[PDB]
């Protein structure tokens, strides 16, 4: 037990967590491809596609960890979407093959979820996205009048013809109840919104829900750009999705629609052994509770998927999916860094202490049998800033190591106002 | 050896732990058994349930698989919840059965090919319309039942049992048609009168329009999962899934597999009959109403469950913590493939339910212990597993291996 | 260190303080062991005195909960004892069913006619039965709809009765068929009349009444008649015992009647005329499969007079949580005073921990290699997790040690068939 | 050197905490001058009798037989008492001549109907209270209140008009048409408070149902115009024994709910009298419904004289009735403590038990060593013999681990008589 123990030095290590310097860890993972870096540390290959979870408080360097991760991917090559807060990465690593969504920067294509769908089982699947679970039990209940609504409203005016975002919205929050009810007519959802009180207490419940997602997608640009026909496209480049930040709140359902998209389309691409993907969400707590992602985590490795994601919070991501399901999502990353809470939160301090483990010792008094937290919650608490501590999937030691804030020239602007 | 702590003098009770071989000498039998991670499965065990707990790609599907296989060498029949056809397109013979909407090898099917006696409706009413995931969305779903039981057994009397006037009537006619059609049925009057009853057909309506469109897009077909149980023929059942379309046909899977769990509590009493139920993800599924007594009251007709569970914690969510603990707990035997050390809560989960030991070591000292820390599991190497059949054995850490099987069969045929 | 070698699983000690003692069987067996004829449990027999403050057997499914209620109730028969069997697919009906002996099922041909009318004595019993017919609600909002449901219940078989017509299938038309206004006309007249109509709430709660007879009833109906009378029965002294039977596929189904007759007998019997001598079981396999009953509780807390005794298995203490909610639950268990303890399963070490907290601590002074006062479990959880199928810790009620015992398989030929398809 | 009252291993010194003490040297301890009652054999000290006594233990453990004896010792001192007494067992070896009884289905019972308390205006809610107890939940209680509305406002009319008839009252509440009812009302302060919009009709349509759950055995029980308050303003008055046959327990509930409450009310009304003893023996406390006045009267009762014994077989049943917070509150009102323990199957409770029991704080042979533990372990009350207690008198007193004695009473009269 060396000086990489914060605790009392130890003759023999039993079992447990073991902790490793920053360079002997570099020493274990360092393999023979090409490997993208965690805080200067060689991630194991086979780790990539059972994602990472990159946890702590604010300015404990989420952003500069995932910048890093981001850029040695692009050294080797590797496609990616990322979620791009102030376009940072996008004025960093844009390259001029790649995208943009956003739907105020000019830069940006042209795109409605019609553009998505190929066969009719892609209309709940994209309405999944648009209209995101709800918080509660009963505000998805309404969540799914909403879904049924749109399906149903916008698979009409994909069959007349007029695929029309503006349409869409006219219909289902500006039409009166009962021009809609009309337009409904011949639809699945024209009996089920009709005949009581109820059928149109659902009805008005989904008109809001509408309302409250819609209006982003409409006064998006349009084009024919396809999210499943660009993760097709070999030689298409990556995804940055952008947005201004005084912009944050309004923007959360669309950008929460286009990451869910990606969720659910790569579980369509086509059997291809060479392929890697990655996602990248600086907060995973900031979009709304997305349907697919969860399976993604699960079922993306055929597909390649490697999802790295930041948390600064445990508590708000409960908050967004509800404690079981927060804890299930948190369960699906496999590999794990620890930035740190802020001494504010011991609650979260607590829980980064035993999320890295214990180990049972023997040390020199004879010797005594003794179980200890590897890092105790106020060594996190007290963690200087950069600084983090990373445990990969399976068996491997832990160890603190400190980020580097290496500087990246701009590229391209980050932002350019659309006209 | 086997116990990561420090080794002892002398054992005193609880958790036994063991060497992976020790303990395939140990549960080795006369008899032709099945293995789990390499180790010979007591055959007292199998009717007594088998739960694989373990995070994403920990080696669950491998451990299912290295089952299945070994129980078909066997010869013992099987139902399988495959995800992407895997193990049909390794195992599936000709004579086995498939059952998907969208493969065109697929057997026609409805409800309705299940009906024997009056009973029959409810019981798989329930199969269609599982359980809801609070007190309240149960209650809506108790008036979808309603609502369905009552319209199906009419559209059977009339002679006209489709699953398309089933639909239409439903979810399709108009509040006041349908009111019509359940005239002469005992949903008549509980169904009006009052705001109350519009509200109640109202909610059920909705429930049955989410789960009845993929039994209506289902080929239609005389085939029955009854009477497939009980063709000592019928090969092995494979219920499989493009995972793109799981969230689309959750409802008619979950129904396939309560339909297998009511339907075997029907059977005939066969001493020697043999069944396997493989559920990949327990928790994928909705909340099923027939499950806890198919895996409690299945002895007789000799049904073996064998389940994975990637998060316990998801699983609280689909049935609620009260009857999931005893969902768990209806299952005998575990396997732990260990959480993510992004989990800690399941890793000392699984940490409690494998035991403590109470040893003595060293003027000697008495300690307990666990057998496994919890930091040991979220350490624990993929395709690692601690075995722990029912009853008193001890448990080994044992090594999965990856065996290799050739497709016999395309995993998918789009119809 | 010459004590707890053998029984107690853990460190041999020098001396016992204080808390749960434990023998071994035949010591048990020598203790408990009394000059009157006694009943056994895994071949321990019970005290005599034991026996009216009940017995739950908890354990996970296959530890043998079956086996040993088996082995209680032929012991009790042996005895010459009356009961009552709550007997899933007739397994008891087909070993120890005599001549004399009663069956309810509605599918069996040997089974008596009966329906709720048939208890009616006094005024007072119409809300009694009524609360057999329509158990508990799972939830407060639950009870309240039956509370709606037995309120239409009553007034409706009341008049039924008062015209003459105690038909089970006449108020089954009435309370689910007859349209709303057609039921209102039929309850103008009774107690229910202005009850169910004047407001939306009011006829809200007539709809929740009729849902919930919609549920409850129909087993009643299809239920065949006769003029069996459960209460009859059980005043009568040369009646046999009852055994409430069922084909297992249709248990579900089956749930509210079987409750029914089960709560029926906890209420009657506390109208038994004073009988020092009488003895009475009742046996229930499963106590969280049946509905959460409204009688239960106090025919095991009063029913001492009448010569109650209830054994009942357990397999999940956390099913009868959902049945009857944490609060009513624990009361429930707290009810029964001794207590078998067959061992959960692995995967649920909650309920092992549970066992092993029930099963106590002991202190004990133990020698180091200078002696040493330590509290510890008698029985680990872990030791729960790994006791072999058909094994018991048998821990009666009162100042008595508990054991460890196995449980034998007796074998019973059938001197009856358990079902005759009627 | 500990000795045998303490269970764990004797020791050295004793430090802090509960005392524990044999039988004999607590019955020598709280001995008095003055004639005292016992608990369990133990005098109880006459300043912990205004305090209250909790008998908290599971079914078959003695309580009914604790009470009894507590009842008995305080009839030979003369004191006046109301019994809450399930199948007249305590009348039938108690009951003098002079004594009440309140059993709708008994012939010997005394004519009773809520109107006979009524002396006052603020009576009508208070004893609406009584009538219609508190409600199990928040929405409940919701309902209740809109039924106390409708109670008092019905019957404060009824005794204008000069019918106040329990039959009369009935009707209107719960047999008149909605329409009729609302023009009863008409003229009473509940005339537009349940009119106007489907919010008021469906408040009405609550209180219908309230009142129709509660009045049933007021109805059915024989008029007559005894009164519990001028009962207990009588000094000459003998005592109260509330009984019931079982088989009808849940039917009576809240009848006899409304009794024990109309007690609690009343006596904080009686003339200040410092000589006055009056006891309120419930046999079970979470059997009756939820009691608004009860608290009052176990904190505001001293004046009174009032001294309430109550058993309890189920603290997790209490909880169920009062709601947790509440149910504390009304336990924590009961000073003395008598544990009778629970049953091997309820480690909780016996948890419970063994905490309120409490630690002490000991030094021991084995240089010496400090220890903080349970003076009662709880596997040591779910162990604990039948008829065997261990009490806990109010303030600074030891505990004692006594036997409970099974004395026998001869009867002294029928336990029920059938009415009619």
Redesign the interface.
Known sequence: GQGEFGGAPFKRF?????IVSGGKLKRMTREKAKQVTVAGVPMPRDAEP?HL?VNGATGTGKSVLLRELAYTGLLRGDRMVIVDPNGDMLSKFGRDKDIILNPYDQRTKGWSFFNEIRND?DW??YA?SVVPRGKT?EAEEWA?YGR?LLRETAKKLALIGTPSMRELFHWTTIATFDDLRGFLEGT?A???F??????SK?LTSARFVLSDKLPEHVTMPDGDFSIRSWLEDPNGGNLFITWREDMGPALRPLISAWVDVVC?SI??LPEEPKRRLWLFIDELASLEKL?SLA?A???G?KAGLRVVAGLQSTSQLDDVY?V??A??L???????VVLGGSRTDPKTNE?MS???????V?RDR?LE?V?ERVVMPAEIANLPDLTAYV?F????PIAKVPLEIKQFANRQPAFVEGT
Not at 14 to 18: A, D, F, Q
Not at 194 to 199: F, L
């Open positions: 039993l079992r447990g967590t073991r059972r979870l089982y709940q699947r999944l039990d799914s049924l699945l024209e009996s089920l009709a005949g009581s009180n109820e059928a659902a659910t579980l369509s349907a399976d985590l699960t079922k490795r509800g079981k399901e804890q299930t948190r369960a699906s990353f496999r590999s794990l829980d035993l999320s890295l483990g214990e180990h049972e023997e004879a049998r179980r445990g999937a399976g068996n491997r």
